Amino acid sequence: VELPPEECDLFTGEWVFDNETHPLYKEDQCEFLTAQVTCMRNGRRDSLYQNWRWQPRDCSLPKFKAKLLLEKLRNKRMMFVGDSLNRNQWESMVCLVQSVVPPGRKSLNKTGSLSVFRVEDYNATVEFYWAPFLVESNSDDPNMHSILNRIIMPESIEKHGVNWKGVDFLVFNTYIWWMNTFAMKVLRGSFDKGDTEYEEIERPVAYRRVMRTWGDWVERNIDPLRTTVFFASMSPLHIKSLDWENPDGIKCALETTPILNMSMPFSVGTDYRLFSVAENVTHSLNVPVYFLNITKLSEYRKDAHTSVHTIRQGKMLTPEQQADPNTYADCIHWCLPGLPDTWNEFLYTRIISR
């Protein structure tokens, strides 16, 4: 295994086709994949999206060996904290490590907000904690159905943070639920006091407030020598095919290859004001935080979304539904294997590097 230089920027590079190494697992090999993300089982027939690897400009990612990762995880906890895209990344990590773990020596247990995947022989866990805004919100139950009015408490994080203490590897995120409305709904008092009044705060201002509460929590509670902290940058959406100069497309649903032309400037609507807030706040802390800068590289992956090959309110989209991607395509979430496996190759690289 060849470790990159500390100074190699892992997030500047290009996508390279490599069906000799990628995907790092097959969909059928991973019994833990949920129906949301098993695109092939769900009817997708092209699989070239699985074959792409990310090649940094100045170095190679080291060959993924799950055993090396699991040795770094022996007697330790890795926890993904955040929204449904961090849950997508957690599912990927589960597949990546479980690839070498024999039957019976692994298990998944979901208890409320916390999902726990155990690897018995290593006494290792890969966990997901639902906190879509990081701070306390009215949307902190992962099994609550949709509401139109999401509300946050930007200075409240202690109750969530109790669940994060003692964890060895922490990967935080938060983005997609910031994007539903122009401004953010911010509670005046506290949910637990029955308060209901909120005001609307500008999206980046409320984000900065959240990131400051989070950073302070980190600074107070994390020992750098015990715990490595990561922050996964904004996972992009691909909802408008004109955004990558394909007006004849249908959202992300007709796309089976990445954007390859590096001289075509484009946007897919990512709110880079939040990216700057996150980049600054994470670099500004005493406790080091490795910023997983996955945004632009993920923007090229117009091909890797679940599209119509997924679920809706708990069941597979029908053939009739799948035939109308304009109405039913999900251009948020990602097929597994696929893009979030790359997000996890960055985590792996950093973990085996220390």
Ligand X SMILES: *[C@@H]1O[C@H](CO)[C@@H](O[C@@H]2O[C@H](CO)[C@@H](O)[C@H](O)[C@H]2NC(C)=O)[C@H](O)[C@H]1NC(C)=O
Instruction: Please give the positions annotated as active site.
Output: 84, 330, 333
Neighbours of 140 (CB within 10 A): 18
Smallest separation, CB 186 to ligand NAG (Å): 22
Size of the site for ligand X (CB under 6 A): 7
Tokens 């203490």 sit on residue:
165
Residue 115 touches which of ligand X, ligand NAG, none (CB < 5 to 8 A by kind)? Answer: none
Residue 271 touching ligand NAG (CB under 6 A): no
Smallest separation, CB 13 to ligand X (Å): 7
Residue 200 touching ligand X (CB under 6 A): no
H/E stretch holding 348 reads helix 339-352
Residue 296 touching ligand X (CB under 6 A): yes
What does the DSSP assignment read for 184-253? EEEESS-GGGT---EEEEEHHHHHHHHHHHHHHHHHHH--TTT-EEEEEPPPP----GGGGT-TTS-TTT
The alpha-carbon radius of gyration of the chain (Å, integer) is: 20
Choosing from 4, 8, 11, 198, the residue that interacts with ligand X (CB under 6 A) is 11
Residue 75 touches which of ligand X, ligand NAG, none (CB < 5 to 8 A by kind)? Answer: ligand NAG
Residue 276 touching ligand NAG (CB under 6 A): yes
Residue 212 touching ligand NAG (CB under 6 A): no
Number of helices and strands in the chain (H, E): 9, 17
Residue 279 touching ligand X (CB under 6 A): yes
Dihedral-angle region of residue 246 (phi above 0 means left; psi in -120 to 50 means alpha; beta otherwise) = beta
Q: Which residues bind ligand NAG (CB under 6 A)?
A: 19, 75-77, 109, 111, 123, 261, 263-264, 276, 279-280
Q: Which residues bind ligand X (CB under 6 A)?
A: 9, 11-12, 279, 293, 296-297
